[PDB]
From a paper:
The engineered Leu114 and Leu137 side chains cooperated with the original V119, L107, V126, and V130 side chains provide the bulk of the hydrophobic core, whereas the engineered Leu112, Ala113, and Phe147 are not involved in such interactions. The crystal structure provides direct evidence to confirm the partially side-by-side manner of FLAL-L molecules. In crystals, the formed protein layers further arrange along the z axes to form 3D protein frameworks through π–π interactions and electrostatic interactions. The significant difference in self-assembly behavior between these two dimeric protein molecules reflects the importance of amino acid residue Arg137 in FLAL, suggesting that Arg137 could act as a switch to control the conversion of nanorods to nanoribbons.
Four helix bundles are also attractive for synthetic chemists because its interfaces are dominated by side chain and side chain interactions, which can be more tunable than β-strands. This study focuses on TmFtn, a naturally dimeric protein consisting of two antiparallel four helix bundles, as shown in Supplementary Fig. 1. By tuning two contiguous dimeric proteins to interact in a fully or partially side-by-side fashion through protein interface redesign, we can render the self-assembly transformation of such dimeric building blocks from the protein nanocage to filament, nanorod and nanoribbon in response to multiple external stimuli.
Author numbering:
A (entry chain H), B (entry chain H): 2 to 164
The structure:
């Protein structure tokens, strides 16, 4: 049941990356709140909470497999963006990086014939598709506002509904 | 309604200190989980969640008062302690530092005649008393185990009950 160290290290690295992800989304919330979009800010706070659930999934899996977690320093995230689109494009680029990190754990797990970790990671592959899809949809809806503040505010209301 | 910058900065500093507090308690959880005390680890995870509620209280108060939040880098917390007592003594020392930081905001708020911030901080003064009390009680119960593993495990079970 004991997990290989190279896979352990990769999962611990990912845990720390999910923590930074949470912090980055909270920083995007600080931007939207300062720009007066409480709905966009709400969506970001929810996303920050979701990223913490990802981190704790990795946390508890590592201990299930006999490893231990070492928390690393969290870098200072950006706190400003040149507009709503710029913020969500930054979120999409961030998620693309997370997705490629997940595939690297998948590669290391299979090289170790660690099918338990391969199975564990399947949820995260599906979740990355979902999260990229949601960010693409927001970018699409924003593009289709064609700069009209009436539409942009209705989008703020919509994203403010996130459960 | 707009808050003074020196008080704004003090609240933003405290927000960042509550974030580190959350991270420190999660790190204590990683220690207890590696030592096989899932009840102690549970208590630490709950405390980490509580510290995030403190941080978000500061977050939303700053925006209520017309300020903005800037998130700073989170330092790497310690991840090892020389035993259960050592961990909780570290938590007590950490909370003592948080408490003196809260009083410094109180001083700056009153110098600005910012009674709104004085009122806001009253909950945190009471919460620090509560948190110091809980850590002192755990240290007392641990001391009274007199090294007996039977009692120490029942304490793990008790702390594992935290809602
Ligand atoms: Fe994630
Ligand atoms: Fe994500
Ligand atoms: Fe606190
Ligand atoms: Fe505290």
């Amino acid at each position: 049941m004991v997990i290989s160290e190279k896979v352990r290290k990769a999962l611990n690295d990912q845990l720390n990356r999910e923590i930074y992800s949470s912090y980055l989304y909270l920083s995007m919330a600080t931007y939207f709140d300062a720009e007066g979009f409480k709905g966009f800010a709400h969506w970001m706070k929810k996303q920050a909470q979701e990223e913490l659930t990802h981190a704790m999934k990795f946390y508890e899996y590592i201990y299930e497999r006999g490893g231990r977690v070492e928390l690393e320093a969290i870098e200072k995230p950006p706190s400003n963006w040149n507009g709503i689109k710029d913020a969500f494009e930054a979120a999409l680029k961030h998620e693309e990086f997370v997705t490629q990190s997940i595939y690297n754990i998948l590669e290391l797990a299979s090289l170790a014939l660690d099918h338990a970790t391969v199975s564990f990671l399947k949820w995260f592959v599906d979740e990355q598709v979902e999260e990229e899809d949601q960010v693409l949809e927001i970018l699409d809806l924003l593009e289709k506002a064609f700069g009209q503040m009436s539409v942009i505010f209705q989008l703020d209301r919509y994203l403010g509904q996130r459960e």
